[PDB]
JSON list of C-alpha atoms in Angstrom, two decimals:
[
{"chain": "A", "resi": 5, "resn": "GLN", "atom": "CA", "xyz": [-0.38, 0.22, 0.00]},
{"chain": "A", "resi": 6, "resn": "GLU", "atom": "CA", "xyz": [2.76, 2.76, 1.17]},
{"chain": "A", "resi": 7, "resn": "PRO", "atom": "CA", "xyz": [5.59, 3.59, -0.81]},
{"chain": "A", "resi": 8, "resn": "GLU", "atom": "CA", "xyz": [8.91, 1.95, 0.50]},
{"chain": "A", "resi": 9, "resn": "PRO", "atom": "CA", "xyz": [11.65, 4.19, 1.13]},
{"chain": "A", "resi": 10, "resn": "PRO", "atom": "CA", "xyz": [14.78, 5.67, -1.65]},
{"chain": "A", "resi": 11, "resn": "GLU", "atom": "CA", "xyz": [18.02, 4.05, -1.95]},
{"chain": "A", "resi": 12, "resn": "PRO", "atom": "CA", "xyz": [21.08, 5.94, -1.59]},
{"chain": "A", "resi": 13, "resn": "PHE", "atom": "CA", "xyz": [22.26, 8.14, -3.68]},
{"chain": "A", "resi": 14, "resn": "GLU", "atom": "CA", "xyz": [25.35, 10.59, -4.14]},
{"chain": "A", "resi": 15, "resn": "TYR", "atom": "CA", "xyz": [24.52, 14.53, -4.10]},
{"chain": "A", "resi": 16, "resn": "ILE", "atom": "CA", "xyz": [26.31, 17.20, -5.91]},
{"chain": "A", "resi": 17, "resn": "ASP", "atom": "CA", "xyz": [25.79, 21.11, -6.23]},
{"chain": "A", "resi": 18, "resn": "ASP", "atom": "CA", "xyz": [25.47, 20.58, -10.53]},
{"chain": "B", "resi": 24, "resn": "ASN", "atom": "CA", "xyz": [-1.74, 26.23, 17.59]},
{"chain": "B", "resi": 25, "resn": "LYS", "atom": "CA", "xyz": [-2.87, 25.08, 13.96]},
{"chain": "B", "resi": 26, "resn": "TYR", "atom": "CA", "xyz": [-0.67, 23.15, 12.14]},
{"chain": "B", "resi": 27, "resn": "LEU", "atom": "CA", "xyz": [-0.13, 25.30, 8.65]},
{"chain": "B", "resi": 28, "resn": "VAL", "atom": "CA", "xyz": [0.99, 21.72, 6.79]},
{"chain": "B", "resi": 29, "resn": "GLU", "atom": "CA", "xyz": [1.18, 18.34, 7.66]},
{"chain": "B", "resi": 30, "resn": "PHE", "atom": "CA", "xyz": [1.89, 15.06, 5.82]},
{"chain": "B", "resi": 31, "resn": "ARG", "atom": "CA", "xyz": [3.77, 11.87, 5.80]},
{"chain": "B", "resi": 32, "resn": "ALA", "atom": "CA", "xyz": [7.67, 12.09, 4.82]},
{"chain": "B", "resi": 33, "resn": "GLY", "atom": "CA", "xyz": [11.16, 10.41, 5.76]},
{"chain": "B", "resi": 34, "resn": "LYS", "atom": "CA", "xyz": [14.02, 12.50, 6.58]},
{"chain": "B", "resi": 35, "resn": "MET", "atom": "CA", "xyz": [17.26, 11.45, 5.08]},
{"chain": "B", "resi": 36, "resn": "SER", "atom": "CA", "xyz": [21.29, 11.78, 6.07]},
{"chain": "B", "resi": 37, "resn": "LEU", "atom": "CA", "xyz": [23.65, 14.37, 3.83]},
{"chain": "B", "resi": 38, "resn": "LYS", "atom": "CA", "xyz": [27.36, 13.54, 5.07]},
{"chain": "B", "resi": 39, "resn": "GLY", "atom": "CA", "xyz": [29.96, 14.77, 2.50]},
{"chain": "B", "resi": 40, "resn": "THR", "atom": "CA", "xyz": [28.25, 14.23, -0.68]},
{"chain": "B", "resi": 41, "resn": "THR", "atom": "CA", "xyz": [26.07, 10.88, -0.28]},
{"chain": "B", "resi": 42, "resn": "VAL", "atom": "CA", "xyz": [22.29, 11.33, 0.88]},
{"chain": "B", "resi": 43, "resn": "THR", "atom": "CA", "xyz": [21.28, 8.11, 2.35]},
{"chain": "B", "resi": 44, "resn": "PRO", "atom": "CA", "xyz": [17.53, 8.34, 3.76]},
{"chain": "B", "resi": 45, "resn": "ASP", "atom": "CA", "xyz": [16.02, 7.34, 7.45]},
{"chain": "B", "resi": 46, "resn": "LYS", "atom": "CA", "xyz": [13.75, 4.55, 7.69]},
{"chain": "B", "resi": 47, "resn": "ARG", "atom": "CA", "xyz": [12.17, 6.44, 10.53]},
{"chain": "B", "resi": 48, "resn": "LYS", "atom": "CA", "xyz": [9.66, 7.88, 8.59]},
{"chain": "B", "resi": 49, "resn": "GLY", "atom": "CA", "xyz": [7.49, 10.59, 10.17]},
{"chain": "B", "resi": 50, "resn": "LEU", "atom": "CA", "xyz": [5.28, 13.97, 9.26]},
{"chain": "B", "resi": 51, "resn": "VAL", "atom": "CA", "xyz": [6.78, 16.46, 8.30]},
{"chain": "B", "resi": 52, "resn": "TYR", "atom": "CA", "xyz": [4.05, 19.66, 9.64]},
{"chain": "B", "resi": 53, "resn": "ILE", "atom": "CA", "xyz": [4.15, 23.26, 10.08]},
{"chain": "B", "resi": 54, "resn": "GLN", "atom": "CA", "xyz": [2.58, 24.93, 12.91]},
{"chain": "B", "resi": 55, "resn": "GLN", "atom": "CA", "xyz": [1.96, 28.99, 14.08]},
{"chain": "B", "resi": 56, "resn": "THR", "atom": "CA", "xyz": [2.30, 29.45, 17.56]},
{"chain": "B", "resi": 57, "resn": "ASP", "atom": "CA", "xyz": [0.53, 32.25, 18.75]},
{"chain": "B", "resi": 58, "resn": "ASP", "atom": "CA", "xyz": [3.59, 34.25, 18.97]},
{"chain": "B", "resi": 59, "resn": "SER", "atom": "CA", "xyz": [3.15, 34.42, 14.54]},
{"chain": "B", "resi": 60, "resn": "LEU", "atom": "CA", "xyz": [6.60, 32.02, 14.73]},
{"chain": "B", "resi": 61, "resn": "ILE", "atom": "CA", "xyz": [5.86, 29.13, 12.14]},
{"chain": "B", "resi": 62, "resn": "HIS", "atom": "CA", "xyz": [7.65, 26.35, 13.50]},
{"chain": "B", "resi": 63, "resn": "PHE", "atom": "CA", "xyz": [8.78, 23.25, 11.02]},
{"chain": "B", "resi": 64, "resn": "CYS", "atom": "CA", "xyz": [8.35, 20.34, 13.44]},
{"chain": "B", "resi": 65, "resn": "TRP", "atom": "CA", "xyz": [9.41, 16.22, 11.90]},
{"chain": "B", "resi": 66, "resn": "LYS", "atom": "CA", "xyz": [7.65, 13.15, 14.43]},
{"chain": "B", "resi": 67, "resn": "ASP", "atom": "CA", "xyz": [8.49, 10.03, 13.99]},
{"chain": "B", "resi": 68, "resn": "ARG", "atom": "CA", "xyz": [5.80, 7.72, 13.02]},
{"chain": "B", "resi": 69, "resn": "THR", "atom": "CA", "xyz": [7.44, 5.35, 15.06]},
{"chain": "B", "resi": 70, "resn": "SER", "atom": "CA", "xyz": [6.65, 6.60, 17.99]},
{"chain": "B", "resi": 71, "resn": "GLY", "atom": "CA", "xyz": [4.33, 9.74, 17.40]},
{"chain": "B", "resi": 72, "resn": "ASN", "atom": "CA", "xyz": [6.62, 11.56, 18.91]},
{"chain": "B", "resi": 73, "resn": "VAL", "atom": "CA", "xyz": [7.70, 15.03, 17.60]},
{"chain": "B", "resi": 74, "resn": "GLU", "atom": "CA", "xyz": [11.52, 14.44, 16.97]},
{"chain": "B", "resi": 75, "resn": "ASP", "atom": "CA", "xyz": [12.38, 17.96, 15.64]},
{"chain": "B", "resi": 76, "resn": "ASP", "atom": "CA", "xyz": [10.77, 21.50, 16.65]},
{"chain": "B", "resi": 77, "resn": "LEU", "atom": "CA", "xyz": [12.70, 24.50, 14.85]},
{"chain": "B", "resi": 78, "resn": "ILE", "atom": "CA", "xyz": [11.05, 27.63, 14.51]},
{"chain": "B", "resi": 79, "resn": "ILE", "atom": "CA", "xyz": [11.56, 29.13, 10.40]},
{"chain": "B", "resi": 80, "resn": "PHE", "atom": "CA", "xyz": [11.94, 32.71, 9.99]},
{"chain": "B", "resi": 81, "resn": "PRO", "atom": "CA", "xyz": [10.41, 34.25, 6.48]},
{"chain": "B", "resi": 82, "resn": "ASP", "atom": "CA", "xyz": [12.68, 33.44, 3.64]},
{"chain": "B", "resi": 83, "resn": "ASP", "atom": "CA", "xyz": [14.71, 31.51, 6.41]},
{"chain": "B", "resi": 84, "resn": "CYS", "atom": "CA", "xyz": [14.92, 28.41, 4.14]},
{"chain": "B", "resi": 85, "resn": "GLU", "atom": "CA", "xyz": [13.56, 27.53, 0.32]},
{"chain": "B", "resi": 86, "resn": "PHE", "atom": "CA", "xyz": [11.49, 24.04, 0.49]},
{"chain": "B", "resi": 87, "resn": "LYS", "atom": "CA", "xyz": [12.88, 22.65, -3.10]},
{"chain": "B", "resi": 88, "resn": "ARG", "atom": "CA", "xyz": [12.93, 18.96, -4.65]},
{"chain": "B", "resi": 89, "resn": "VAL", "atom": "CA", "xyz": [15.78, 17.76, -6.16]},
{"chain": "B", "resi": 90, "resn": "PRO", "atom": "CA", "xyz": [15.55, 15.83, -9.21]},
{"chain": "B", "resi": 91, "resn": "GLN", "atom": "CA", "xyz": [18.79, 13.92, -9.09]},
{"chain": "B", "resi": 92, "resn": "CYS", "atom": "CA", "xyz": [18.09, 10.83, -7.76]},
{"chain": "B", "resi": 93, "resn": "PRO", "atom": "CA", "xyz": [15.17, 8.88, -9.38]},
{"chain": "B", "resi": 94, "resn": "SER", "atom": "CA", "xyz": [12.66, 6.28, -7.67]},
{"chain": "B", "resi": 95, "resn": "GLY", "atom": "CA", "xyz": [10.52, 8.39, -5.72]},
{"chain": "B", "resi": 96, "resn": "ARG", "atom": "CA", "xyz": [9.72, 11.66, -4.14]},
{"chain": "B", "resi": 97, "resn": "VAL", "atom": "CA", "xyz": [12.78, 13.83, -2.90]},
{"chain": "B", "resi": 98, "resn": "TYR", "atom": "CA", "xyz": [12.70, 17.27, -1.29]},
{"chain": "B", "resi": 99, "resn": "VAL", "atom": "CA", "xyz": [14.91, 19.14, 0.30]},
{"chain": "B", "resi": 100, "resn": "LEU", "atom": "CA", "xyz": [15.25, 21.79, 2.29]},
{"chain": "B", "resi": 101, "resn": "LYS", "atom": "CA", "xyz": [17.96, 24.86, 2.51]},
{"chain": "B", "resi": 102, "resn": "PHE", "atom": "CA", "xyz": [18.50, 27.36, 4.59]},
{"chain": "B", "resi": 103, "resn": "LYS", "atom": "CA", "xyz": [18.76, 30.88, 3.12]},
{"chain": "B", "resi": 104, "resn": "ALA", "atom": "CA", "xyz": [20.14, 32.28, 6.33]},
{"chain": "B", "resi": 105, "resn": "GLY", "atom": "CA", "xyz": [22.69, 29.76, 6.34]},
{"chain": "B", "resi": 106, "resn": "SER", "atom": "CA", "xyz": [24.63, 27.06, 4.92]},
{"chain": "B", "resi": 107, "resn": "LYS", "atom": "CA", "xyz": [22.85, 24.51, 5.91]},
{"chain": "B", "resi": 108, "resn": "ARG", "atom": "CA", "xyz": [20.16, 21.48, 4.61]},
{"chain": "B", "resi": 109, "resn": "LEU", "atom": "CA", "xyz": [18.02, 18.96, 4.93]},
{"chain": "B", "resi": 110, "resn": "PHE", "atom": "CA", "xyz": [16.82, 15.95, 2.65]},
{"chain": "B", "resi": 111, "resn": "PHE", "atom": "CA", "xyz": [13.05, 14.37, 2.99]},
{"chain": "B", "resi": 112, "resn": "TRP", "atom": "CA", "xyz": [11.22, 12.20, 1.37]},
{"chain": "B", "resi": 113, "resn": "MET", "atom": "CA", "xyz": [7.07, 11.70, 0.90]},
{"chain": "B", "resi": 114, "resn": "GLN", "atom": "CA", "xyz": [5.74, 8.76, 2.40]},
{"chain": "B", "resi": 115, "resn": "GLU", "atom": "CA", "xyz": [2.33, 9.53, 0.53]},
{"chain": "B", "resi": 116, "resn": "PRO", "atom": "CA", "xyz": [1.25, 6.75, -2.36]},
{"chain": "B", "resi": 117, "resn": "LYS", "atom": "CA", "xyz": [0.17, 9.66, -4.42]},
{"chain": "B", "resi": 118, "resn": "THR", "atom": "CA", "xyz": [1.63, 13.04, -5.76]},
{"chain": "B", "resi": 119, "resn": "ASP", "atom": "CA", "xyz": [-1.30, 14.55, -6.35]},
{"chain": "B", "resi": 120, "resn": "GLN", "atom": "CA", "xyz": [-1.22, 15.86, -2.69]},
{"chain": "B", "resi": 121, "resn": "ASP", "atom": "CA", "xyz": [2.78, 15.88, -2.28]},
{"chain": "B", "resi": 122, "resn": "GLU", "atom": "CA", "xyz": [2.98, 18.68, -4.94]},
{"chain": "B", "resi": 123, "resn": "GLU", "atom": "CA", "xyz": [0.47, 21.05, -2.93]},
{"chain": "B", "resi": 124, "resn": "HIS", "atom": "CA", "xyz": [2.04, 20.14, 0.28]},
{"chain": "B", "resi": 125, "resn": "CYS", "atom": "CA", "xyz": [5.34, 20.93, -1.02]},
{"chain": "B", "resi": 126, "resn": "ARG", "atom": "CA", "xyz": [3.67, 24.58, -1.85]},
{"chain": "B", "resi": 127, "resn": "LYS", "atom": "CA", "xyz": [2.59, 24.92, 1.49]},
{"chain": "B", "resi": 128, "resn": "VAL", "atom": "CA", "xyz": [5.45, 24.03, 3.00]},
{"chain": "B", "resi": 129, "resn": "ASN", "atom": "CA", "xyz": [7.26, 26.77, 0.73]},
{"chain": "B", "resi": 130, "resn": "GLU", "atom": "CA", "xyz": [4.30, 29.21, 2.11]},
{"chain": "B", "resi": 131, "resn": "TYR", "atom": "CA", "xyz": [4.54, 28.33, 5.85]},
{"chain": "B", "resi": 132, "resn": "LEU", "atom": "CA", "xyz": [8.76, 29.07, 5.46]},
{"chain": "B", "resi": 133, "resn": "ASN", "atom": "CA", "xyz": [8.04, 31.94, 2.88]},
{"chain": "B", "resi": 134, "resn": "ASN", "atom": "CA", "xyz": [5.08, 33.77, 3.44]},
{"chain": "B", "resi": 135, "resn": "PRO", "atom": "CA", "xyz": [3.64, 33.14, 6.89]},
{"chain": "B", "resi": 136, "resn": "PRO", "atom": "CA", "xyz": [0.12, 34.51, 7.99]}
]
């Protein structure tokens, strides 16, 4: 029913 | 007290250059006190207790979406007054309300009553 949590990822201020 | 906004959302942890979501799903809601100060609080759904509580001044921070990691709805709160930012993910099955919540958050944090 409810949505699953997101997975880890890289974040860069592009 | 009145809740300006409220929706299911979990917090995340950004370290260095990697963002890791927290499984401790909570609720991101906004409440304005009699002091006319908007309160930004995040309550964990695990215990339903308010784990976060901080007043956000007008234009103090900006609520926006981060379309970098495709998979779900991910938003980031950036404090214009400082250089600290937070990341959150919506738990709502449909985004038909996520967009509105997102707008409301920016309205309560940038356009308080």
